[PDB]
Amino acid sequence: QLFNNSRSDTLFLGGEKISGDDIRNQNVLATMAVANVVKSSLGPVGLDKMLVDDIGDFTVTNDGATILSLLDVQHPAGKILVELAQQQDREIGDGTTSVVIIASELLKRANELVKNKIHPTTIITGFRVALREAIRFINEVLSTSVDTLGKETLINIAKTSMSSKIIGADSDFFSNMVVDALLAVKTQNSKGEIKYPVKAVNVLKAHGKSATESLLVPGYALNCTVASQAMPKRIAGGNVKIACLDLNLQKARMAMGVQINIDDPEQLEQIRKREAGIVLERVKKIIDAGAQVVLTTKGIDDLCLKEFVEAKIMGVRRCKKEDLRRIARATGATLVSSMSNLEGEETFESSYLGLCDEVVQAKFSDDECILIKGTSKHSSSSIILRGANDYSLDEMERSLHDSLSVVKRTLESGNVVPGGGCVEAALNIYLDNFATTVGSREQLAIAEFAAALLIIPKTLAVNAAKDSSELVAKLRSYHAASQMAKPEKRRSYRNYGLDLIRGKIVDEIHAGVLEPTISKVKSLKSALEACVAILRIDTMITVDPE
Amino acid sequence: ISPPKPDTENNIIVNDYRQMDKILKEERAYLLNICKKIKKAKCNVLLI
Amino acid sequence: NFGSQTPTIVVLKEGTDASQGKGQIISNINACVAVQEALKPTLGPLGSD
Amino acid sequence: ELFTEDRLGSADLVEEIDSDGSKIVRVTGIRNNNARPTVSVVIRGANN
Amino acid sequence: EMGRPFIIVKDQGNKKRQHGLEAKKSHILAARSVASIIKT
Amino acid sequence: RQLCENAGFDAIEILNKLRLAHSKGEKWYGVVFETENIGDNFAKFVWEPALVKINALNSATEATNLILSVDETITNK
Amino acid sequence: SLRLPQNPNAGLFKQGYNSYSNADGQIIKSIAAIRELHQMCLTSMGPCGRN
Numbered sequence: 004q005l006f007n008n009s010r011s012d013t014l015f016l017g018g019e020k021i022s023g024d025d026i027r028n029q030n031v032l033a034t035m036a037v038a039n040v041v042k043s044s045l046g047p048v049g050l051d052k053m054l055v056d057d058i059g060d061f062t063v064t065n066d067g068a069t070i071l072s073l074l075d076v077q078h079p080a081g082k083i084l085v086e087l088a089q090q091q092d093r094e095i096g097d098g099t100t101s102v103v104i105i106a107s108e109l110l111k112r113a114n115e116l117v118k119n120k121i122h123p124t125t126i127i128t129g130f131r132v133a134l135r136e137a138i139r140f141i142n143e144v145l146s147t148s149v150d151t152l153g154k155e156t157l158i159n160i161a162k163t164s165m166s167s168k169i170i171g172a173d174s175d176f177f178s179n180m181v182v183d184a185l186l187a188v189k190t191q192n193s194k195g196e197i198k199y200p201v202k203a204v205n206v207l208k209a210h211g212k213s214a215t216e217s218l219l220v221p222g223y224a225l226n227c228t229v230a231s232q233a234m235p236k237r238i239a240g241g242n243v244k245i246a247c248l249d250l251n252l253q254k255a256r257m258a259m260g261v262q263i264n265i266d267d268p269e270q271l272e273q274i275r276k277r278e279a280g281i282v283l284e285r286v287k288k289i290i291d292a293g294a295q296v297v298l299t300t301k302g303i304d305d306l307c308l309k310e311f312v313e314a315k316i317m318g319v320r321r322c323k324k325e326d327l328r329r330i331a332r333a334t335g336a337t338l339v340s341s342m343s344n345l346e347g348e349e350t351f352e353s354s355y356l357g358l359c360d361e362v363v364q365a366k367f368s369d370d371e372c373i374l375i376k377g378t379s380k381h382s383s384s385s386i387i388l389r390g391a392n393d394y395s396l397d398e399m400e401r402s403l404h405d406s407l408s409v410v411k412r413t414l415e416s417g418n419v420v421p422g423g424g425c426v427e428a429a430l431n432i433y434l435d436n437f438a439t440t441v442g443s444r445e446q447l448a449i450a451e452f453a454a455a456l457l458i459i460p461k462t463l464a465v466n467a468a469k470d471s472s473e474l475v476a477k478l479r480s481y482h483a484a485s486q487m488a489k490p491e492k493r494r495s496y497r498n499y500g501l502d503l504i505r506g507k508i509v510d511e512i513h514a515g516v517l518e519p520t521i522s523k524v525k526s527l528k529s530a531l532e533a534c535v536a537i538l539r540i541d542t543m544i545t546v547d548p549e
Numbered sequence: 550i551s552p553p554k555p556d557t558e559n560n561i562i563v564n565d566y567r568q569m570d571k572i573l574k575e576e577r578a579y580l581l582n583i584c585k586k587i588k589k590a591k592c593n594v595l596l597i
Numbered sequence: 598n599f600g601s602q603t604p605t606i607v608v609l610k611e612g613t614d615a616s617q618g619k620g621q622i623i624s625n626i627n628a629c630v631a632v633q634e635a636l637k638p639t640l641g642p643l644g645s646d
Numbered sequence: 647e648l649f650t651e652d653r654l655g656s657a658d659l660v661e662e663i664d665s666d667g668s669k670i671v672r673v674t675g676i677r678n679n680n681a682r683p684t685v686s687v688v689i690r691g692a693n694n
Numbered sequence: 695e696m697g698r699p700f701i702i703v704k705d706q707g708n709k710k711r712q713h714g715l716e717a718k719k720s721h722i723l724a725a726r727s728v729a730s731i732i733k734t
Numbered sequence: 735r736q737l738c739e740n741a742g743f744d745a746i747e748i749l750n751k752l753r754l755a756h757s758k759g760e761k762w763y764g765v766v767f768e769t770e771n772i773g774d775n776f777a778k779f780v781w782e783p784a785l786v787k788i789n790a791l792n793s794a795t796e797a798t799n800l801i802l803s804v805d806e807t808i809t810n811k
Numbered sequence: 812s813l814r815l816p817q818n819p820n821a822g823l824f825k826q827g828y829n830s831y832s833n834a835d836g837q838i839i840k841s842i843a844a845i846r847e848l849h850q851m852c853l854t855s856m857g858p859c860g861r862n
């Protein structure tokens with residue numbers, strides 16, 4: 004911090020050498036330097052940010068998942084928090100902003116314990132006994148989500164994930180959208196275990212009216228253009244057959260290394276004809292099957308387009324692999340990589356075709372989308388987001404994508420807990436009485452671990468531009484009486500948090516904000532494992548590149 | 550598991566339009582009878 | 598009007614340091630803590646020079 | 647030609663789970679019971 | 695640092711520091727370098 | 735705090751002994767480096783005037799309050 | 812098309828001289844230029860003012 008140290012005094016290293024508490028201080032400032040951009044983005048009162056790529060392009064982002072991934076940091080101690088933000092997005096999909104703040108403060112608050120001659124091995128042991136004591140207390144205080152006869156255990160869950168976004172005001176409209184979407188795309192596996200594949204719904208970047216008037220599609224929406232303009236755009240009538248092909252349908256050459264050689268020039272035209280005919284024989288049998296709509300991964304040549312225009316078939320090129328599996332899964336078809344069977348003959352059976360009620364191509368602000376609705380075998384869903392531009396919709400795309408992961412977890416695990424820093428304030432009262440029981444040096448480690456957990460409710464008040472100590476002192480008073488509740492419900496002074504729009508302490512159950520308990524579990528372990536990685540480092544050895 | 554060829558490069562010629570029907574059928578037939586022997590041996594998992 | 602550029606008038610001179618935000622007073626505290634670290638081990642009879 | 651059933655092993659459960667993004671193929675049990683078995687353990691962690 | 699030039703003493707980049715055990719080894723070996731001149 | 739860290743002793747055992755022993759150690763209770771223990775300083779004949787203490791707190795309180803009333807930094811040239 | 816005429820009859824005065832009329836929102840900019848140092852005075856009036 005003060006000055007640079009001596010460069011390899013009687014050590015003979017090509018790179019730099021540093022040791023002592025100086026690098027330990029640099030890791031604290033390194034974790035705090037990358038955490039300051041995450042501070043202002045926490046809670047509903049947080050504001051968004053924009054990252055410029057020095058080419059004019061910019062992107063608005065609130066969550067610290069992709070912000071820290073875009074910020075190219077060269078200090079390796081900061082890379083662990085960068086990967087921690089990416090790690091938490093994969094498993095849980097929510098709380099990337101919280102683990103960076105929690106992990107940074109645990110290292111910041113533990114920095115005072117370093118110069119007290121408390122070893123890091125004793126500090127992490129005091130943190131770990133506080134962790135498993137906190138997990139059991141979280142397992143005591145949580146609650147199942149069937150919860151009540153009315154739903155609204157899913158309408159309220161969406162508000163927590165939808166808060167701190169541009170469309171947080173429209174969360175009342177989008178709360179019904181996300182719950183209706185994930186209940187349509189469920190599946191069955193492992194003999195009774197229900198799964199909810201995230202990203203299976205199609206998020207379209209449309210422009211137009213507003214985010215409030217975003218129409219929920221009762222079915223999947225394919226984002227691709229029509230091949231020819233002379234084709235029929237709208238196909239009515241029930242039992243519309245869906246064909247999902249992937250083989251190469253355009254005219255292709257012979258095998259990858261063979262050479263066509265012929266002596267008799269009479270058959271030179273005939274081999275040209277059958278190469279043009281062998282590709283049309285495949286299109287002939289699809290017309291015999293009567294598939295109104297056909298989808299292909301590869302291209303579609305003009306030799307095939309004439310047959311679809313004549314027979315009124317909807318041929319669409321330039322489909323992707325991951326989409327057609329969901330089309331076949333929803334419409335009831337099966338993925339056809341090639342047309343063949345166990346016998347030597349080549350044919351096409353009608354069982355490979357799907358079924359849907361209606362297919363309509365719609366265009367909105369230079370965005371052609373094929374609206375497939377009314378799947379008979381299994382339902383599907385897609386959300387057409389509408390806003391100002393593509394870069395504003397990227398925040399909405401991440402806002403919706405994080406909302407599916409949160410609503411995924413509350414259905415997989417019915418246990419939930421209230422927001423507003425309730426459990427973060429409750430663990431402090433639980434750990435203070437436990438810190439005195441253990442006696443020896445781990446009291447300060449467990450105590451300072453509890454003090455670091457209060458940063459989540461404190462940051463909600465700091466970013467709100469209000470008085471923070473009064474809200475924290477009132478939240479401290481109610482949680483202080485929870486441990487001394489004196490059971491005989493009348494077990495009140497629990498399940499309360501901050502209300503920032505009004506600045507009062509009210510019941511979070513009635514306010515309608517909840518979060519699954521599994522997000523709290525994985526966030527605490529991943530935050531502490533990152534804290535263990537930084538505390539145990541003593542000396543750095545940076546080797547310059549050759 | 551591939552269509553029939555030695556490890557070295559080869560040349561296949563086509564002197565008549567009817568030869569292509571035999572080539573496209575026999576190339577998958579070499580894959581078909583391998584799957585029949587796999588089905589006869591009831592081998593459900595393969596590692597290539 | 599006398600020139601095609603029309604330069605925008607900056608309030609302060611060129612090279613003047615930054616201004617209000619988050620971390621201004623914290624930098625002054627960290628600057629004092631930095632100087633305080635050098636004089637830290639020199640306390641008492643069992644200190645150093 | 648030398649492919650037969652005597653050269654193949656056996657197992658009770660062969661599956662591929664997707665445990666929170668980390669995709670892994672797992673085999674459970676071996677019915678051959680050879681002389682010297684082998685050991686396989688997967689290492690999981692938050693950071694690489 | 696927080697992006698701003700964090701400087702305290704004049705000529706910050708010129709002067710260096712040394713602490714811990716490495717500061718002591720520079721002192722004792724410097725005396726041994728002079729002691730070898732005087733010992734012979 | 736730092737007076738004992740330079741001595742090589744653990745700060746937790748010292749600081750826990752100071753607080754709970756002020757009742758019998760009314761005013762002359764402090765650290766002793768010779769015996770590696772904590773006892774009464776009146777018997778050890780270690781004295782110091784009070785003027786260092788008054789000017790230290792007044793100068794330290796004036797120093798911290800000076801820049802605590804500052805949230806700006808202007809540097810011309 | 813590639814380059815403007817860059818304000819003809821500009822040699823009446825020196826190149827360093829510049830004019831700033833009321834149009835083009837420049838009076839709004841002068842109010843904004845006052846607003847830069849005026850906000851510095853907000854933290855410095857009163858008994859709780861900061862040096």
Ligand SMILES: Nc1ncnc2c1ncn2[C@@H]1O[C@H](COP(=O)(O)OP(=O)(O)O)[C@@H](O)[C@H]1O
Nearest residue numbers: 046047066098100163164166167422423424516
């Ligand atoms: N309406 C609300 N009232 C009080 N606290 C809230 C509210 N919405 C969110 N929070 C708090 O914000 C924290 C993180 O919010 P989150 O939705 O993860 O933000 P982000 O989407 O930016 O990651 C939660 O721990 C929760 O307690």
Ligand SMILES: [Mg+2]
Nearest residue numbers: 097098163164
């Ligand atoms: Mg969230």
